């Protein structure tokens with residue numbers, strides 16, 4: 001050994017009674033620790049630093065277990081030293097793991113799998129090593145106050161000094177040019193501040209007289225919109241840092257000709273759903289955020305949801321009410337779940353966050369507010385409605401809370417009673433006062449716009465009056481910022497008129513009609529004289545598929561402007577920004593007109609600048625897309641139609657996610673014609689990346705569509721009990737998925753490995769524990785979402801399903817192959833079992849890039865034209881009989 005038989009202790013973050021953590025180290029094989037929740041790990045302190053040579057683990061039974069062992073010599077960093085990932089059963093002899101004489105004062109054992117239960121266990125753990133004579137070192141989470149930073153000095157300088165602020169802005173608009181099209185095009189522009197045009201945001205583009213482009217605008221985003229206007233209408237250039245670009249500039253800067261002056265009737269152009277921060281932006285670095293804000297300003301956006309670094313604000317707030325930093329970390333979710341954590345739906349899951357997290361994200365948020373200030377983009381910060389942890393009373397006995405029940409199998413945080421009786425302590429007032437103060441401490445006065453949404457998708461209003469709740473929440477927000485505007489989401493008829501009528505100051509609230517392009521609900525808001533924004537939702541969960549509503553955008557936005565007195569803006573509220581760039585380009589365009597436009601000729605113009613060129617055939621393919629996947633519909637529907645490939649296998653499947661659809665409302669063979677045309681023009685257009693993007697989009701749409709048809713043939717073949725029929729069609733079905741995987745390999749944005757690597761690398765000098773945990777977050781979100789009770793009982797299984805390379809191969813295909821094998825076995829042998837899908841899915845979720853399989857961050861050289869012809873030939877609906 002030698003075995004460390006003394007001074008060793010252990011902690012855990014949950015257990016089923018009375019299977020406490022100490023039962024893992026009590027020398028007794030008949031006693032065990034057992035997990036109760038999603039913290040499936042224990043932490044052994046060794047009473048000093050040892051050089052470990054061996055670690056021995058015993059489980060309570062003969063099930064197959066999988067786990068990862070991490071160690072620390074500094075008490076801060078936990079690095080992986082051992083793991084079990086083989087399918088061998090536990091037995092009476094235990095598992096012995098050799099350690100490379102690694103210095104360790106603490107150990108973590110994360111038992112990520114148990115073949116017999118959702119719940120995990122360690123009966124005993126023995127650690128063998130050589131005592132170093134040393135002891136683990138002492139360090140507390142500490143963050144800077146905004147006012148004490150270079151950010152505050154800069155922020156105030158912009159605020160007080162007009163000439164400085166203008167210089168800063170103009171220089172930023174110029175840096176934007178250098179980032180977007182290249183440094184060599186920067187001095188080809190002259191940027192000027194002008195006034196508003198009758199109280200409206202405005203830009204101008206004209207010729208300087210010496211071959212440069214002169215652009216005027218009342219602020220940053222107006223300038224960047226003039227820049228984009230020039231690129232789009234004169235340079236035939238189209239920028240989308242997420243969904244494909246044409247950035248090929250002419251040899252000479254083209255002349256503007258006659259001067260243009262373009263204003264917008266809208267006070268706000270809005271961007272972001274709480275969900276975007278999770279489904280898309282979870283693992284974004286500053287570079288990705290910088291890109292995004294350039295694209296924002298260029299698209300006219302001046303109002304943007306901002307929850308970056310809100311974990312520090314909450315930490316400082318909770319610290320005042322009896323919570324340690326560790327307890328705060330247990331409250332807050334992991335980095336993929338902030339959407340539903342800030343919307344009061346869930347706690348804990350994916351966590352705990354590393355100690356490093358707090359400072360890094362406060363800094364990222366300060367960085368973002370600096371650029372936003374330069375552009376004149378208002379962030380929407382956080383308001384406070386009463387959200388507290390479920391043990392808030394234990395720590396603050398006089399506090400009055402309301403249990404909020406569950407959300408999709410998760411426990412919702414409590415909610416402080418917004419008001420109490422006389423003679424009762426008012427903890428809404430105490431905690432709200434701290435919250436707004438700590439939010440100032442972390443970021444300063446950066447905005448008058450605050451977002452909070454009590455009772456989002458459920459909860460419980462207890463004994464309280466609905467209107468009185470919304471009266472007090474607003475009054476309190478205005479208390480700490482007299483100019484405050486409470487940004488309120490409008491989702492599925494909530495908040496009701498009765499909550500909304502509680503708003504005593506209508507000017508200081510702004511309601512986001514979240515789903516205005518499928519299900520508008522602004523009439524109720526307009527009738528109550530409430531300022532409101534018209535929003536395109538479009539995207540649910542980052543689910544992919546050809547789908548957009550260009551005609552409604554072209555018509556309904558200007559029509560709403562004319563039919564109303566309280567529409568203060570338009571915007572986007574997608575759950576992910578990863579799909580259908582047409583929709584988002586058209587919506588932000590609709591801000592700069594009071595008249596309806598022609599969606600058909602708009603598209604004709606759009607595709608030319610996107611591909612860099614156009615022709616008769618490419619146009620007619622896009623008309624086919626407009627006539628099919630993009631055709632105006634009048635039904636209710638959430639998201640693009642879902643692919644059967646991404647569905648949990650079975651009979652009578654009508655979607656992949658619980659409240660989704662797989663119904664194709666257009667003619668499939670008609671849509672396939674677009675792919676024929678794209679393939680026919682491939683060689684001419686392959687120099688365009690945005691063309692390849694769209695080709696991959698419609699081609700993977702073609703194969704999703706045909707897969708559905710093939711699935712029904714093979715289902716009919718089994719239900720008719722033969723047989724070698726089934727083998728054939730089931731085999732052609734799996735072959736189709738293998739072709740799909742090749743299609744998806746062509747796009748960097750469709751690679752699972754990019755999502756995952758971004759998770760593992762988003763902070764620097766992270767230990768293996770943090771990287772592994774963040775990869776858990778990335779895997780789980782796009783698949784099971786949560787654990788068994790969240791995936792199954794909760795309805796969240798495959799909610800965020802992705803048509804992604806690697807994921808399709810190792811997860812979607814694998815599910816379908818097992819089920820086929822399957823039915824075949826029976827049809828020949830009998831009979832086919834019930835497959836416990838979650839088990840199989842969570843197997844993949846818990847795999848790690850460094851020990852299991854590293855997914856590529858690099859696209860393939862596969863030929864889409866060629867791939868398209870293979871699709872038309874063998875895997876199409878058009879040729880489906882042959």
Ligand SMILES: CC(=O)N[C@H]1/C(=N/OC(=O)Nc2ccccc2)O[C@H](CO)[C@@H](O)[C@@H]1O
Nearest residue numbers: 273275340457491514540541575638659799
């Ligand atoms: C799981 C998830 O992300 N659900 C989101 C969500 N789900 O909406 C649905 O697709 N449908 C659905 C919503 C409520 C009840 C049943 C289905 O939309 C809301 C607004 O975009 C978000 O606030 C919810 O977080």
Ligand SMILES: [Ca+2]
Nearest residue numbers: 023028031123
């Ligand atoms: Ca024991």
